[model samples]
Each structure stands twice: as structure tokens, then as C-alpha cells.
Target: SDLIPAPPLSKVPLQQNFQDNQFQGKWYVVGLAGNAILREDKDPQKMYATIYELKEDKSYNVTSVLFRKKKCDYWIRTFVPGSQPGEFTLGNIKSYPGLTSYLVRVVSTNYNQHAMVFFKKVSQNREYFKITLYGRTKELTSELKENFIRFSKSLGLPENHIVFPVPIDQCIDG
Candidate 1:
């Protein structure tokens, strides 16, 4: 199928999940729950699948990563923090709806337990593509997993479309 459909700003539900997301650390793709690019390989010992916080100003930082060694090369984009629904913008990326260019609008947050995050893709020139999703601590609990799946579906994303990366630390030695 073509790229997954996304939910509109007005349709995005304000699920209470996140409050404060300020911290300095890149998210590692330990595994993709379903079908999606898992850049590099599945060798947890190779240290491949990854994403990084290139730069930080406050709300967001410049992001860079390699999505499937060949597909998405290590590109750079500025993640502007979203102010409200239909807000926020990513510097640039060539996704049709421009979902890769939008900032995250926090539908809701609990500060510690969970946060409902929406990915809004912005167009480098004019229009933008946006998608909403919930990002938790990666440790998917039974209840959390169910909620995430439901959230994804509400946002029009396939339940099995999420692909996580291999935890980089697994390749590092203490």
C-alpha cells in the first residue's frame, strides 16, 4: 500500500499523556512492532538502527538519522515545537504529505507515565503532511500496548506499521 494515511489536526484527540518532554537523549529503534524500515540490520550487537538529537534549542533539536541505509540517508531537519493543534513544523524532508517535516503537537501528557505525541510533517516550501502518534518510554506494557494500538488506529496508522530500532547501548561495553 501507499504511505499510511494521517489524522487531521481537528480530529487528533487530546489524550493526557505528556507534560514535560525536555531531556537530552536520542531515541534508539530497538524494534519495529510491525512493517517499516529498520535501517541497517537486526544485529543488536552491530549498533545500526538509530536516531540522534543533532542540536537542541529548547522544545526540539536538529534531528539526523539513517532510515534503512539506502532509503533515507542521514538527513538533517529542525524540529520546531508545536504550540497547538495544526502547529509545529519540521525544517524539511521529501515525504508527500510532508509528515516528516512537521513538529509534534502534544495532545496530552502526564509528564512521567505517558504522553500522546502527534507527528506533523511540514512542507519545505508550501503545504505539509501530518500524522499523530503516541510515544511512550519504549517499554510497552500490556495496557500501554493496547492503548498505543488504538491510538495509532485512531490516527489512521496501521497497528503493525511501527518498527523500532535496536538499542544502541546493547552494542556498547561498560
Candidate 2:
């Protein structure tokens, strides 16, 4: 093996009893951590929304929408089952080559909230982490955001690294 130590990664806990079927529905991104891929405008005011649809083949079809200015940018993501029940491999996007992402539901309130952690281990010296806090409604409670930040810090995210994206009134198509 090469004589280099592995990259640093947060010791975040993964969610348990995550049922895929029950996770279907619309979710709004309330909090985000880490910087990786992004939208075209890269505006902080943009609101991100997602729809998770359960497929017949034990997979999930995710539709993500980013509201910016007066329009919205949409993309689709597919998550297939991994070796474990609560684990999944995010499908490849043509734009993101040599990129592999694994998703785990770190926590969920069964019906109202969910905290998903996305991790990528590219090499022994390189790793990426992103945590998305989702809510069933457009507005997330202050307590939830606080708890999310605490959980994010537990996963090695710096306080300044955590961000709250402002939600738009609505995403309109021209």
C-alpha cells in the first residue's frame, strides 16, 4: 500500500430503520453542509427542492429542482440499493465523471424531517462530505436547524461551513 494516511472524515452516525417506501414524497432542503457540485448561478438565495419517488425495482427516482431568479433548474438522480438495506449508490451523471457518491439516511422523523449524509471517498487522501437537512414543508423550525448544526459538527463540519439557503417564493418557468 502507498505510505499515505487516509483522509479525514467525520464520524457521523447513520440512520436506522430507514424504509424506502415510506420516504417517498416532496422534501425541501433546509440546511446544507460542505461544498462540492453546485448550480450554474451559484446564488445563495436559491431554494432547492426534491421529490423522491419509489420505483418498482427497489430503487428511488429523485427529482431535484433549484429555484433561481425567476426560473428553476431541474435534474434527476437515481439511487439503487446497495449491499445493505439503508445504504445506496447514487447513479452517475454524465457531467460528473469518476465521481461516486453514497447516501445514508442519518436520521428521520418518520414523517416530518430527514437528515441525509452524502459521502465520497475518492482516494486514501481525498474525501468529500455533504449533509442535507430536509423538511416536509418549506419552513423548517429553529430547533430543527439548531439540532442539525450540532449533528453536522459532530460529523466534523465547522460552524462556518454550515449554511442555510434562502427559499424562494416559488420557482416559475418562463
Candidate 3:
């Protein structure tokens, strides 16, 4: 998964008739997978929480809360919508200036219980791609787990690169 680049738009399909408001509510990331994910031996492969708010201008105001170094870290960013329904351009890259290309795709989502999203960042010289499985709650269906695995592997990520992140109950809020 390292050497290869992100897939083309034609290969990654968006959810049919993706309900904007339905997906706006808070979401919990249950699974993490990518070419650059943490190793299986790592202690903290845990996932985080996000609240997606659709703005009037068709942008998404996202509040992402996670644990970093045993402390809570909150990040707010806006995702600019693309011509397609679920495609997006990433916002608030805190690196040197910003990555040349930071793209996002809403791969699939039921809008009721589960959602799958991926972000692929390719700088002038570096690359970072990540796929996440989001649940309405911390709990997830067995079928959903398998679905996440199948999708992640399809992206060239092996089992060792996939992480079923533990819940940081303290970080995820009401």
C-alpha cells in the first residue's frame, strides 16, 4: 500500500443519494486503515469522534475530537464540497503552508448507522492516505466490521495496517 498512490475517482464510488442532514450528526470512528496507519503492535491505535455540520454554502464544518498523548485534542475544519455529491477538498492542514493536494471522499454511508470515508493527502513530496469507518455509536455490527476489512484490503492495505480502534469514552461527547 505504500508505493501505490490513491485510486481514481471512477474506482471509488459515493453513497447513492447521500443524505446531507442525516450525516451531519455526531459520528464515532470505529475502524482505521491506510498505508500510513499505526502498526498492530502499537498501544494506541484508538479512534476518535467527529461532528459534521453542513453549512449553507455547501461546505462542511467538522469538529474532530481525539486523544493525543493521553490528552484531549479538538480540531475544527471545513471541507469544501466538490461538483460530485460526496467528494470534498480537505481543510486546515497544519503543516508547512499546506499539502498540494488534500482530497476526501465519502466512500459509502447508510446515513443511519455506519459511514465510510477516506482522506488522501499528497504533498509535493510526501503522501498520506487514510480510511475510516464511522459508527453512530461505539458499537458496530459484525457485518460492518467485515465490510470495513474488505474495503480496506481492497485499497492495498493489509491486516497489519488496519486498526479497530478502542473507544476513548472521555473524548467522545454528547
Candidate 4:
């Protein structure tokens, strides 16, 4: 019995009765954690922004950009429905080729303010996790920041993993 270890991961809870349309728009990354695809070694504020454009068939077109070490990198991902409502399978995630499944959960949001968590499992052994706090504006509230940290911890992320990145002026016009 001791040989079999329980799953080291938890089934992170997703938003109930998620409304896709409500989540569509430009969102600024206020807080980030984990090694996101194509986002490695990139500062959160230096390269983290996403725009979700909803499609006709219940899918979405996501455009994300990140600046790492003075180099600007951008990529697009397609979001398709999974077995669950709030769960989604992100396509064109070139950062991690072996990536099998993508799970995005809306921890909490109020149109103008939002918090999101992105998780991915490569095969069955490798897992990638990231937490993002989205805001209508570039700035985030202290309360919201605290909430994201707490939620990230619930997902088993360490304190050092969570980061609040400052926006870089160079990317503002880009």
C-alpha cells in the first residue's frame, strides 16, 4: 500500500457556470506564478498581457506577449472546450510541445477585476502551473493581490513562486 503514492496534485476548483463572454477582453497581468509556456525567465511586468477574442463556435482566440531579457516574444493560443464548463484545452502552446491538456480556471472576477489560474499536464508525470491576476487597468488593488496569493497557495504553490511584476514602460507602446 505504501508503494502507491496519492496524487501529489489536487483537482483545482474552477468557476461554476462560467460565462465565456464575460471573460472576453484585454486583461493586464497583475500577478503571476509558475513557469508559463514561452514565459520562462520573463519578468511578469516585462512580458505578460493577454487578449481573449471569443469566436462563433464557443472557442476563443488568445493573443499573449512577453518580453524576456530585452527580446520581445509573442504567441497566440486557441481555447477549446473541455469536458467541463470552466475547463479549456489551449492549443498552439508551442512553448511546451509535450503539453497534453490545458486547464484554465476563473478563481474570481467582477468584469473589471479578475483572477485566473492556468494549469497544464504534460503526459502524466510533468505538470505546469501558473496563477494570473487580471485587471481592467494596469494597476491592481491590495485586496485583490492578497486574494490571489492565498488562492495560489491553496494550489500548493510556494511563497517564492508567487510574484507581483511591475509594468515595463518599453512594452507599453508595443
Most accurate candidate by lDDT: 3
How far off is residue 86 in model 3, in Å? 0.9
- For every model shown, what is its TM-score relative to the native structure? 0.52, 0.77, 0.89, 0.77
The number of clashing residue pairs in each candidate reads 25, 0, 0, 1
Where is model 3 more than 4 Å wrong at Cα?
1-4, 91-98
Residue pairs that clash (backbone atoms under 3 angstroms), model 2: none
- Could you give candidate 3's per-residue lDDT for residues 64-174 as a string of tens digits? 998887788898888888677788887656653647878888999988799999888877667878888999989898999999999888887888878888886677866
lDDT of 2 at 24: 84
Candidate 2 on 90-137: residue-level lDDT in tens? 766434665554454445455556556454444333455677788777
The deviation in Å at residue 94 for candidate 1 is 11
Off by over 4 Å in 1: 14-59, 62-76, 85-87, 92-101, 122-138, 164-174
User: Which candidate wins on TM-score?
Assistant: 3
Q: Which has the higher lDDT value, candidate number 3 or candidate number 4?
A: 3
In model 3, what is the error at residue 73, expressed in angstroms? 0.6
The C-alpha lDDT values of all candidates are 0.43, 0.65, 0.82, 0.67
For residues 36-81, write the lDDT of model 1, one tens digit per residue: 2223443532223223243445444534444353344454445554
lDDT of 2 at 156: 60
Model 4 clash pairs? 47-67
The true-versus-predicted C-alpha distance at residue 127 of model 4, in Å, is 1.5
